[PDB]
Ligand SMILES: Nc1ncnc2c1ncn2[C@@H]1O[C@H](COP(=O)(O)OP(=O)(O)O)[C@@H](O)[C@H]1O
């Protein structure tokens with residue numbers, strides 16, 4: 229894919245409340261020309277190369293101007309009012325990030341605190357990052373009540389992994405530079421901690437289960453295994469318990485586990501810290517933790533185990549040490565009075581041998597908070613926090629795709645805006661609605677820090693698809709959001725949905741937008757990846773997926789590229805591997821049919837390549853055809869995507885829509901992208917997209933839809 233880029237003028241961001249937060253201000257036309265949305269990271273290049281998060285510039289900022297704070301100008305090697313190269317950058321989740329600082333901060337600030345303070349932010353080697361933008365007895369009490377422990381010291385990034393540009397994730401490890409010979413070496417990492425029975429917990433079990441109903445099921449599993457083993461023995465069930473908890477990053481998976489195990493003794497390892505250890509020290513750490521949990525019993529908990537036991541991509545299989553690490557865990561699970569719980573944002577990022585009867589026999593998927601749940605979280609985050617008229621309902625309504633981690637960061641930022649307002653007024657800081665709303669202009673949700681992340685796309689980002697949205701809302705959202713009314717009205721349990729249409733028309737895009745609603749756990753796979761890329765049995769991956777969905781209800785099961793997952797008999801010959809998968813799939817689909825809190829949806833560009841047994845009643849029987857965007861639809865798509873692109877008077881998006889027959893939704897989005905770029909390159913100071921700019925763009929952006937293939941898809945439901 230061609231790497232788009234623009235030279236802009238770099239002006240110093242004069243707003244202190246907008247500076248030193250890892251945010252660069254760009255005109256929307258730049259975002260359009262570069263092919264990115266707000267909150268996407270950009271590469272910034274002067275004499276040096278750095279990266280920052282693209283935030284939309286306020287009014288009064290011409291398209292040819294980028295606003296950079298003092299540290300960004302320094303990191304990019306750009307003088308004020310000088311030229312800067314801006315371009316989209318690939319930002320992977322960091323395995324590790326090594327930072328350097330004073331001997332005092334190196335000894336006083338834990339790696340967990342570092343990760344919390346820098347969560348979601350982009351890092352590049354050589355960069356100067358700030359843990360806190362600003363810095364009295366009432367203000368310090370405020371900072372601590374909101375959870376600000378660290379200070380405002382500027383650090384430097386001495387290393388990242390993988391190389392290039394990375395973002396700090398919950399499964400990342402952020403550790404000090406080890407290390408300057410003069411200064412003392414920093415404390416050891418990757419070793420287990422023990423929390424005794426009935427220990428003081430920051431977040432209670434009651435607090436957790438109001439937005440995470442899955443905590444009730446986890447608690448019930450633990451109690452049966454550890455407290456009432458004769459009940460399970462009477463039924464012939466297994467007394468052992470291994471659980472893999474998954475769900476969006478920072479949604480609160482680890483906090484839920486600690487809350488549920490509050491009355492138990494917990495032996496806890498930090499997956500990333502241990503995973504970063506030298507291979508032999510890594511094994512010893514796991515071994516020490518297993519012997520400790522089996523010495524007295526209780527819960528062995530590994531937060532973010534995907535950093536410790538990565539799934540591997542065949543080019544690199546799992547390391548040999550993983551076999552021995554798994555043997556230790558397996559030994560723990562078989563121990564009476566011992567239970568094993570591990571977390572991971574994406575389950576398939578963990579070694580396949582962990583998702584097995586011998587270690588983790590069952591799984592639990594958490595969900596994004598809906599608007600109601602978000603308001604519950606904000607009120608919880610603001611206990612003992614001096615405030616006025618916060619209007620939390622409005623803040624909750626304006627944070628879709630957010631998680632508690634983000635909301636916490638929103639509140640911390642709000643405390644800074646209050647403390648800044650306080651210092652000028654000399655009054656004691658008191659949070660108002662302005663602070664929280666102002667925080668939203670600088671805080672990037674974790675769901676936007678890396679698509680394919682649940683919450684990155686919302687229905688507003690989807691132009692048009694009125695009829696498709698309508699059908700999906702009624703077929704998927706309505707039954708899940710109203711279980712009892714549907715049952716008492718004698719409405720059938722949610723029918724399986726097959727979503728199909730020509731490429732670049734949003735059949736996948738709209739599902740991802742739909743899946744960001746909240747109060748609904750999403751369990752999604754791409755047909756190709758599960759079959760070809762994943763190390764492990766594909767047939768067991770199917771049963772695993774559905775079992776996690778059943779246990780995490782209300783659940784949506786998204787089988788994208790369903791044609792690859794279940795092709796027609798004869799298309800594949802792999803010693804019966806495909807057969808077992810399809811037969812297992814049919815079996816799972818039939819188990820989902822009577823359920824009311826689980827919906828299954830398959831998507832494909834080629835429905836005729838699916839085994840017809842998938843399309844029988846009780847299975848994927850609701851056929852939703854996604855039409856290519858007509859004249860009406862193209863108007864919406866253009867207007868949605870081109871909303872903030874300044875246009876010249878001789879540009880009419882409506883008449884343009886009528887002329888774009890054969891252009892898919894993606895084609896239209898690309899025509900605006902190309903148009904904006906054509907205008908930016910033509911004249912920076914005369915940025916307004918002209919009719920000629922669009923005319924030139926149409927030379928490179930061609931129609932992609934085949935009228936015969938489109939006809940073939942439309943007739944599919946009747947044939
Ligand atoms: N009820 C709560 N009150 C305050 N902070 C919370 C609460 N729940 C979660 N957090 C914070 O949000 C972040 C995300 O929680 P965590 O469980 O670590 O996410 P993950 O799902 O990635 O494990 C954590 O840093 C935690 O400190």
Ligand SMILES: Nc1ncnc2c1ncn2[C@@H]1O[C@H](COP(=O)(O)OP(=O)(O)O)[C@@H](O)[C@H]1O
Nearest residue numbers: 690691692730731732733734735736737893894
């Ligand atoms: N209605 C729409 N509005 C805006 N962008 C869209 C729309 N439909 C599709 N796209 C663009 O197309 C991309 C994916 O297209 P989609 O049709 O979902 O996949 P497929 O090619 O598998 O059908 C998305 O990243 C999105 O940018």
